[PDB]
Amino acid sequence: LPNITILATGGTIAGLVNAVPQLKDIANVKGEQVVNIGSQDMNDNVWLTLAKKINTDCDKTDGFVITHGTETMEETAYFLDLTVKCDKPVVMVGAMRPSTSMSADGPFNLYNAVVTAADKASANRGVLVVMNDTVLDGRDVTKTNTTDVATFKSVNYGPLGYIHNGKIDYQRTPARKHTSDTPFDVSKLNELPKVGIVYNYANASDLPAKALVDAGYDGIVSAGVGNGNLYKSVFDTLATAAKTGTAVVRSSRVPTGATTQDAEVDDAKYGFVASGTLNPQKARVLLQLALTQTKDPQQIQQIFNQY
Amino acid sequence: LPNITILATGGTIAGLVNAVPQLKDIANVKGEQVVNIGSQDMNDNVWLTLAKKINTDCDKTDGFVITHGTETMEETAYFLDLTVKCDKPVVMVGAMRPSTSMSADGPFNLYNAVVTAADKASANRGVLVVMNDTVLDGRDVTKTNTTDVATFKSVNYGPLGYIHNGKIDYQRTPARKHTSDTPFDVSKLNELPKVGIVYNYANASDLPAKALVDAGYDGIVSAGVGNGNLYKSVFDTLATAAKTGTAVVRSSRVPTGATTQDAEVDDAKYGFVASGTLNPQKARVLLQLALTQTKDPQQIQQIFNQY
Amino acid sequence: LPNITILATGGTIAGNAVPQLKDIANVKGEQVVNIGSQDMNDNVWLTLAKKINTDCDKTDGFVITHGTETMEETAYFLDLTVKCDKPVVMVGAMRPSTSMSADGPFNLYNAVVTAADKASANRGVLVVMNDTVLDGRDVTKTNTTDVATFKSVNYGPLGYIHNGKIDYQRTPARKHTSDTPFDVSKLNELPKVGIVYNYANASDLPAKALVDAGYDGIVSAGVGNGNLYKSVFDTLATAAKTGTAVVRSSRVPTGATTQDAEVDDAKYGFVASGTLNPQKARVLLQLALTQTKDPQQIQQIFNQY
Amino acid sequence: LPNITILATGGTIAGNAVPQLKDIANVKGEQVVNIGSQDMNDNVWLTLAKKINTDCDKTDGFVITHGTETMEETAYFLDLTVKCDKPVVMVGAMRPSTSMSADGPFNLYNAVVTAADKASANRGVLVVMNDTVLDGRDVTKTNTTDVATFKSVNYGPLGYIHNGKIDYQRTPARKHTSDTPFDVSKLNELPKVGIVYNYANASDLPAKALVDAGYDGIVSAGVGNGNLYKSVFDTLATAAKTGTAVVRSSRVPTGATTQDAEVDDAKYGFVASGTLNPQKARVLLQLALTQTKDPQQIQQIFNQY
Ligand SMILES: [Zn+2]
Ligand SMILES: [Zn+2]
Ligand SMILES: [Zn+2]
Ligand SMILES: [Zn+2]
Ligand SMILES: [Zn+2]
Ligand SMILES: [Zn+2]
Question: Which family does it belong to (chains A, B)?
Fold first, then answer.
């Protein structure tokens, strides 16, 4: 059987080979606790240590499964999608119900994540998220409902495949460049560029925006209204920010659909970057990484058009 | 025919009786430009003037249609749902495509909004949003896609009815108290309590939260991760805030599903309020209004359980 | 504690495998029939409806375990025929009860909570699945395998369940339960109604065979807004003019088949099904045919229930 | 500018009513047939496929105007039979071209942009509607009246259109166009395949009539994961054992009908349709039957296309 490494970032989602013994019949599992934290507290340090671990141990194993909380799983998955250089399957998985709760979802989630990680056909598709019998790509996947076990969905382009009876039918694969095809290399980095997110809505204070500028943040992501629009006070602070060196990326609070370039706002005029289908938290991820390569908004836009 | 008043808050969404003449065959339309602004700039002053106008003119007409931009329509609609005391239909409508663009959606949107406003069966259901042949309640309706004409949907409980050939079949009506059944009365108010929204994600700065506290904001709404969870730095600032008088409401960045009380966080312990199915921008609306009645988080929670 | 009766129609969906039930209700159970839901039939429907109506005053609410294949059919039939205003809640499982992360146990727990909540009464026959309370009319099966498959695709759910509490924010407008004019206590059988499908180059043979067998009604799973392939139209038009009740529904999973849109229904005596999908339409047409054979009266029924 | 040919099969969906087309392509048009899409048939399919394959080297891409009722059927049939790798894009309108806010004009503009974009080639036959580029296999009609009805309910769309530009982020894995073993140039007719529906108490009469008429294949719109009402099962089992190709699909709008799950397919010679809904399954079974009558070979086809 294939040997799959399980990297845990927190508690157990099932309760591992003893908690879900059926696992030892499809893979050879070793487990390492890499960090232990709730995902609402996920952070840069954790991201860096994970990417490095996966990159160092790529040849010690046939695949990876990462147990992680659901709240920020979608951010971690995209970070790794951009930084892992192991074309072998890296599959993330979590659980929406506590492991001791009735009809706990963890056990079967874990099983299906190991199934996915172990299938050769899963290789070379970038980092994946596996939940609710579905194989989801790290870029587009996002949490759609606060409590539903079916919460994870790729709301713009769809899943990569479905899992029935330990088998996967892949009918899709992502087009946006990832893993070995990106120029990102966090292997020597101990920190990441500071990027914050500000929200837009009626009568929005500019204060949040101004705090980030005061603190010399490297980038700021705007969760805009509609097609990335900005409340005027926020538009003014961000315009300013962009002229004094803070990268500014326009995304949207609207859960699906792209924030398009030169549509609602003149990005070229202000030196802003439109995030495409990257929601705010995902846009933060690429902006941070783009900032380790360049600070030219034109080049940041190009990065946003390709990753 | 019934006489319907169209209150415009910005430009035309069609191009009114001359731009969509079919209108004069279903209603008697008068139009007033109440303000002229892009909805990304929507604000308290506009909300107050609209509520008052609708309340003053309730007996001058059989119904209201409000033309408004799409970016914050969902916020205005809920504000009015809470403050209008005219049980007559108040129907909001906007357009996702410019009026001069091919297959402009405005014309037929406007027509269907007038159809809705004119149907007696539409009365007593609170403030409505009409878009894409659908009648949506002001509380649950939200913008789901950045550009799609079908963007407005009530993502937790569904629409109230569908519109085919100028006819409506209502199969639902909202249960949460609105209009005349709320204690909110902005008729004498010239300002609203200050409420801001802060976003949570991996490695979230507490700075935004702290700016609002520094400025003596009355309330703060957290767009949390998952079931309203908070990044630790943000959790600490907000906990503090709540002890020194800032109302704190936990909502979620996740587009559907409720942020439940005493689930992921101990709201009772910290004096926080869980927003139920109110997304961040909608939660801001009720929190602002709840703040004109009380500052006791227990009572704010009760308000969040009933409106 | 509330008395709740679990009426089972098949195999179990849990396994007490859910001891936590003692915390919310006094539970007793009866195996009413035992079949795979894909073989659900008129006899089961009649007996179920009669059992609930007969037993209404012995318990505080009912939970009905049922396979997922035709849960949406039974739920609507019960929605139209139950004369008990106490909560009737149907429940199933998408995963075998012995499979890992089986959904049955929590689904069942949630159904008893729903059946026992006093706020659940007077909302008609309910279906509880994946933490959601769904009305029997609009509820349909949306995905072949996903635990979250049950959704009310047109009008949404009535309420969500978290930690054993329901936040109801909706109730259906279409009349059901004791508000309908249907009465199963007098029926040992139901009018014959079949369903035919429409698609490119569709044979009229299925429709023809139904008519030849003297079927009381036929529901057309049409294309788009209830349209019909030419040959199927031709056949059903004659049928409707000669006494067969004919209802236009649609193969399209959401949205209504409207009146006076695509087809001139009055001209032929056809009835438009509204938001009722073909299998749901069938439930209502069978029932309407126990009350009348008149197309206009049947359309009225379809506009009301 | 690119040469794009618009092949019309019905009434127009715009009305130049869209002069803005001159900005993106040199357009010429031919009325290939003229019918309501609810009467779409084998003859139209054959002629369309032949026309595109014959005319492939005269233009840069094709746009096909087609009614919405069976757009998803034609699109898949073309997906399986077009041997031209240039973009073929189907397009419709959900509102009358003269109604207010008609969708046809912008839909058409978007289809020509798609047909003319060089990045659109080699993705198979496409359907463009509501600013979205959708593959012909997974695309289905989701709502009876909404302009946004066309969606790829299982795997999503290939790309979105904004301001005349497409951000393609997906392409289908299932082989299509010249990769299939089908060849319509040799066909004046297609094998007879009908579709029967399953639901509670389903009559076996439709299935029986199809078999009696010597149908080459039958697709079952089953319940849940492709299951069958007892009587329909019994009939199709005999049919499959005696030479009728039988494909299990599902009435359920999303998700696959899987192999070796609910039914022992090999035991009877049934074929599981995968994510192919009944009308789509029919398209592929008709085509498979022009190549073989062997169930295992047909299942292989269903696992590949
Ligand atoms: Zn990727
Ligand atoms: Zn309301
Ligand atoms: Zn009902
Ligand atoms: Zn009643
Ligand atoms: Zn294809
Ligand atoms: Zn090829």
Answer: Belongs to the asparaginase 1 family.
- Report the DSSP pairing between strands C159-162 and C165-168: antiparallel
CA distances from D54 to C283, D50, D51, D77 (A): 49, 6, 5, 16
CB contact under 8 A, B156 and C156: yes
CA distances from A272 to A210, A252, A301 (A): 17, 14, 8
Q: Which residue has the tokens 């029924």?
A: C301
Ordered DSSP codes for chain A: --EEEEEESSS-S---TTTSGGGGGT-EEEEEE-----GGG--HHHHHHHHHHHHHHGGG-SEEEEE--SSSHHHHHHHHHHH----S-EEEE--SS-TTSTT-SHHHHHHHHHHHHH-GGGTTS-SEEEETTEEEETTTEEE-BSS-TT-EEETTT--SEEEETTEEEE-----S--GGGS----TT-S----EEEEE--TT--SHHHHHHHHTT-SEEEEEEBTTTB--HHHHHHHHHHHHTT-EEEEEESSSBS-B-TTSSS-HHHHT-EE-BT--HHHHHHHHHHHTTT---HHHHHHHHHH-
CATH no. for B1-193: 3.40.50.1170
* Euclidean distance between CA atoms D82 and C236, whole angstroms: 35
- Measured in Å, residue D262 CA sits from the centre of ligand 5 at 27
CATH 3.40.50.40 placement within chain D: 192-304
CATH code of the region A194-306: 3.40.50.40
CB-based contact B3:B17 (threshold 8 Å): no
Q: Are C79 and C137 in contact (CB under 8 A)?
A: yes
Task: Please give the Cα distance from C12 to C205 (Å, whole number).
Answer: 39
Q: How many CB atoms lie within 10 A of CB C46?
A: 18
Q: What angle, rounded to 10 degrees, do the helices at B73-83 and B44-57 form?
A: 50
Touching C: D residues 214-273, CB under 8 Å: 215, 221-230, 250-258
- For residue A92, what are its two tokens? 């993330």
Residue with tokens 């949490």: A143
CA dist D112 and D97 (Å) reads: 17
Q: Where in chain B is the domain with CATH 3.40.50.1170?
A: 1-193
How far apart (Å, rounded) are the C-alpha atoms in residues A230 and A242?
A: 14
- Ligand that lies nearest to the alpha carbon of residue D123, given by its number in the listed order: 5
What whole-number distance in Å separates Cα of residue C53 and Cα of residue C81? 9
What 3-state class would DSSP assign to B204? coil
Residues A146, B227: C-beta atoms closer than 8 Å: yes
Resolution in A: 2.3
User: Would residue B28 be called left, alpha or beta, if left means φ above 0 and alpha means ψ between -120 and 50 degrees?
Assistant: beta
Cβ contacts of D39 on chain C, cutoff 8 Å: 229-230
Active site residue C12: yes
Picking from D103, D146, D148, the nearest residue to B103 by CB comes out as: D103
Residue of B9, B97, B101, B203 best to disrupt the A interface, most CBs of A under 10 A? B203
Q: Which CATH architecture has domain C1-191?
A: 3-Layer(aba) Sandwich (3.40)
CB C147 to CB A148 under 8 A?
A: no
Question: Are the Cβ atoms of A109 and C101 closer than 8 angstroms?
Answer: yes
The answer to whether the beta carbons of residues C127 and C93 sit under 8 Å apart is no
Burial of B141 (0-12, 13-18, 19+ CB in 10 A): buried
Q: Do B50 and B83 touch, CB atoms closer than 8 A?
A: no
C-alpha pair distances (Å), D87 with each of A67, D5, D81: 43, 11, 13
Find, among A146, A39, A130, A149, the residue nearest to B226 by Cα: A146
D162 bridge partner residues: D165
Protein residues within 5 Å, CB atom, of ion ligand 5: D 79, 124, 137, 172, 176
CATH class given for the domain over D192-304: alpha beta
- Dist. CA D217–CA D207, nearest whole Å: 10
